[PDB]
């Protein structure tokens, strides 16, 4: 295993069934793995090498779907090669899937507290190693069959899955984007900071509570204009606890300079005080099981 | 509700063209072997139905629903004419020097504009004109794809200034003339191999388009008519931008003496690129 290299995947990883996300396996162990396969030009291969040097290293962590490495499956000369980004497998789907299947498209507050803490613990690990995730959203928060919460990592340190295959030219979905990452009249140069992940975490908590991020009903281009202008988003319903409202307001501080860090939000009462944690963990494991059958 | 299953009628071959369009496949009509493009969506049809009957718009064939087990999300299939010779972005990328001959640009730009004129006369704005949505057939016919147009913002480089919301323009005013700005950027893309601001971060380009003066061709080699055409498409304030009809009369578009040879040169280029 090497994360500073760019070898052919043959004899290391192979694809089993469905850049597109594929189910794959480590040849020698038989361990399942999610593999992102992208078409790369023979010129984009030189861009990968530079981005691989930009990679920051960090250990395994229980809240991060481990990034195993990058590989290039070479095609005949002239023909577009294949970039493979290999990551640990999470079989119970995303948090967006979880909230979508449930009745009323809303999760119980103690489920949001549990999932949000796992997201933050994963983020704390990335931030302490000087890495910004940059794409926190319910789709990138996965569940294992054992109700373990893991952040998608296809080489987040150098954003290997967002910089090649003409993907780099796409703006993407704007709804989880922090105000500072949106270039507007007062912010001409986008400023990605570790705290941009915390804004995304707050939008993910709203998404778990309501089934969709704020401004979901708007055209992405309109939402992109409104995020840096609108006051921080709020939960629509008054049903929620005072701690949950407080948590949202904590993440969603408009000016990133004044937004708390991961450690400070990990101490927030909504995250810190989870009396029914054991039952939540059981309720989630049970929800995953009955959804499978 | 009367949409049938595609089995035995259309089959998916492969993704076209490796993520750039999303879930769009090169399909095949089972009984004839005739190729088709199929837009597969997880489940705006009559838009592609009556507005695609024009030689410069890829023709709509039909709609199908591939039924999944109860509870599991079904698949809508939208089938249209396949354009086998790739996009004009592919064309310029696959040309030596990443630039097309001016008479090729004149020809392709006229076909884009004729497709746009058809859409605009029916009160339809394409909204996503770019080299990647302008396709070639094997016999060098030019066809527009992806009109209508939901949560993903694509590439910003071909977007007109008025379509980008800012302090003075809070509500992005999509107008038929926004497609003409996109056609001018497509002509620059054919001339240089990339749109203006290509070297910038898409988010930075989105900030600069409504602020920057109209883009210009970098080289002085081009004819005065071609410079005039670019200036016509790229008028900053859409209120003074010409209509599709006015640009169709522009000398660069209207006066094409070597049209027959261009068509032959394009057919020949498509063939050499295939092998
Ligand atoms: N006719 C053809 N022949 C050959 N290659 C073709 C390649 C692409 C297409 C095509 C057809 C179509 F309906 C829509 C789109 N584009 C998108 O779906 C983009 N969406 C914007 C919002 C979500 C994604 C592309 C037709 C082809
Ligand atoms: Mg047609």
From Swiss-Prot, chain A:
Compartments it resides in: Cytoplasm
Active site: 135
Free-text tissue specificity from the UniProt record: Widely expressed. Isoform 5 is abundant in the brain. Isoform 4 is predominant in the liver, skeletal muscle and placenta.
Superkingdom assignment: Eukaryota
Ranges where the Protein kinase domain occurs: 13-271
Residues reported to bind ATP: 36
Subunit structure: Interacts with the SH3 domain of the adapter proteins Nck. Interacts (via its CNH regulatory domain) with ATL1 (via the N-terminal region). Interacts with RAP2A (GTP-bound form preferentially).
Function: Serine/threonine kinase that plays a role in the response to environmental stress and cytokines such as TNF-alpha. Appears to act upstream of the JUN N-terminal pathway. Activator of the Hippo signaling pathway which plays a pivotal role in organ size control and tumor suppression by restricting proliferation and promoting apoptosis. MAP4Ks act in parallel to and are partially redundant with STK3/MST2 and STK4/MST2 in the phosphorylation and activation of LATS1/2, and establish MAP4Ks as components of the expanded Hippo pathway.
Family to which the UniProt record says this protein belongs: Belongs to the protein kinase superfamily. STE Ser/Thr protein kinase family. STE20 subfamily.
Protein name (Swiss-Prot/TrEMBL): Mitogen-activated protein kinase kinase kinase kinase 4
Lineage: Eukaryota, Metazoa, Chordata, Craniata, Vertebrata
